[PDB]
């Protein structure tokens, strides 16, 4: 069980840790988060009381170093940092654990929600989407635009998701215009899976990371990437049977976890209706379709 200690909490903030959140008051005696399950990536995120603009946060894996949070009053945010002196870090964390100044990551034992939402997400791939190599953790916020968005403006602060564009030469083989546009199996299986991602696990990882950036930060270009990767599979007549089963499970927990009140902005009516009712895989997502119909029938 690992720990992200905090130097202080000088400004009032709603702190998110994976799918949980809790309110910290200005100068409340708060010194971090303990009992964080080893073996998954995590995201700690922030929404300031005063200016709800800019949700921002850090993707990290505790196996990759000792990380803490200190508020920077010049840049005005809670920054993640890596303390290299591991003995100073045990002493600091033990002091705060003894003074009971930390909240406990509140995992219910039956609860596999985070494992299911992050099944294929790996830090090493996060760090290639979010390029900041002098840090082991990855910063994301509401406003960061994606590489594809910047094509259609600061490259350093971009989300380098895999570009997907159904009306592009990458996607459409010369002489197979109709075939490949109405049945994206070529784009999915040869171009993307075999060519770019190497395997379905990398593809699912990016899809899951896009959804989480969309849900936790309201990052609009991530939501675009999530839907595009869903549509590419649904629009493929020919998909490995294991990929389909997994997708159904992946999406089910994304829709399960989504806040009911944010459905109006995070779900693309056109993509979902097409995927569940018109696409090739309209019959291949029983769990996702059952939950979508019971929970968000208005959108459909």
């Amino acid at each position: 069980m690992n720990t992200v200690p905090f130097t202080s909490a000088p400004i009032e903030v709603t702190i998110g840790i994976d799918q949980y959140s809790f309110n910290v008051k200005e100068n409340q005696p708060f010194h971090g988060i303990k009992d964080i399950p080893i073996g998954h990536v995590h995201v700690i995120h922030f929404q300031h009381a005063d200016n709800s603009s800019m949700r921002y946060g850090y993707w990290f894996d505790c196996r990759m170093g000792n990380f803490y949070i200190q508020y920077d009053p010049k840049d005005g945010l809670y920054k993640m940092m890596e303390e290299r002196d591991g003995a100073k870090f045990e002493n600091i964390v033990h002091n705060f654990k003894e003074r009971q100044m930390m909240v406990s990551y509140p995992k219910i034992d039956e609860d596999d929600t985070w494992y299911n939402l992050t099944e294929f997400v790996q830090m090493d791939k996060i760090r290639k989407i979010v390029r900041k190599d002098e840090n082991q953790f990855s910063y994301v916020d509401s406003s960061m635009t994606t590489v594809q968005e910047n094509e259609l403006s600061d490259p350093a602060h971009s989300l380098n998701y895999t570009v997907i564009n159904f009306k592009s030469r990458e996607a459409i083989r010369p002489g197979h215009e109709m075939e490949d546009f109405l049945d994206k199996s070529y784009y999915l299986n040869t171009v993307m899976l075999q060519g770019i991602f190497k395997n379905s696990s990398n593809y699912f990882g990016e899809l899951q990371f896009a959804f989480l950036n969309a849900m936790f930060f309201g990052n609009y270009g991530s939501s675009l990437q999530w839907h595009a990767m869903i549509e590419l599979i649904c629009s493929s007549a020919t998909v490995p049977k294991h990929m389909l089963d997994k997708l159904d499970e992946i999406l089910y927990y994304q829709i399960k976890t989504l806040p009911e009140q944010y459905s109006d902005i995070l779900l693309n009516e056109r993509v979902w209706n097409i995927c569940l009712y018109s696409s090739f895989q309209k019959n291949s997502l029983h769990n996702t379709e059952k939950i979508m119909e019971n929970k968000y029938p208005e959108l459909l």
Binding site: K167, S168, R169, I172, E177, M178, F181
Partner: peptide, 10 residues
């Protein structure tokens, strides 16, 4: 539009 757009990607 789409049929033509796709055939005219060049």
């Amino acid at each position: 539009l789409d049929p033509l757009e796709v055939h005219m990607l060049d």
